[PDB]
Write an enzyme that holds these catalytic residues in place. Structure first.
Site, PDB file in Angstrom:
ATOM      1  N   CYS A 105       0.687  -1.008   0.156  1.00  0.00           N
ATOM      2  CA  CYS A 105      -0.333  -0.159  -0.161  1.00  0.00           C
ATOM      3  C   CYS A 105       0.968   1.147  -0.008  1.00  0.00           C
ATOM      4  O   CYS A 105       1.173   1.848   0.818  1.00  0.00           O
ATOM      5  CB  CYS A 105      -0.547   0.132   1.180  1.00  0.00           C
ATOM      6  SG  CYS A 105      -1.981   1.120   1.470  1.00  0.00           S
TER       7      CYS A 105
ATOM      8  N   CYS B  26       0.356   4.017   2.939  1.00  0.00           N
ATOM      9  CA  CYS B  26       0.429   3.196   4.118  1.00  0.00           C
ATOM     10  C   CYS B  26       2.210   3.555   3.854  1.00  0.00           C
ATOM     11  O   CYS B  26       3.007   4.218   5.146  1.00  0.00           O
ATOM     12  CB  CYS B  26       0.641   1.994   3.961  1.00  0.00           C
ATOM     13  SG  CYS B  26      -1.207   0.943   4.144  1.00  0.00           S
TER      14      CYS B  26
END
Length: 113
Positions: A38, A41
């Site tokens: 991600c 993230c």
């Protein structure tokens, strides 16, 4: 020249240890739910590191990899990442989805504890 603020380090919590480290804590706990694939993230990880230091002795900051630990996000309704969840006294207190910048994140946590 001094030591950088990039601690690049924060403790991990798992499906095995979530109750023990999060729900049983007397401190408010912030958990960053993340995965390596991600993009947002990965942008959020260094922010989480810096906030752990600025919130020392006030908020316990942890990160949980949801590839390795899928059960806890499922239990709390997490459908997407980044997700940051705040806990206090054994229960969820608040949640936000998506990248959050450092000042906003600190403002939110301080409003919540």
């Amino acid at each position: 020249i001094n030591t950088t603020q990039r601690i690049n380090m924060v403790n991990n919590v798992t499906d095995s240890s979530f109750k023990n480290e999060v729900l049983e804590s007397d401190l408010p706990v912030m958990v960053d739910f993340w995965a390596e694939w991600c993009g947002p993230c990965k942008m959020l990880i260094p922010i989480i590191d810096e906030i752990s230091k600025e919130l020392q002795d006030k908020v316990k900051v942890l990160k949980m990899n949801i590839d390795e630990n899928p059960k806890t996000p499922s239990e709390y309704g997490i459908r997407s990442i980044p997700t940051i969840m705040l806990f206090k006294n054994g229960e969820q207190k608040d949640t936000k989805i998506g990248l959050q910048q450092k000042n906003s994140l600190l403002d939110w946590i301080n409003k919540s504890i």
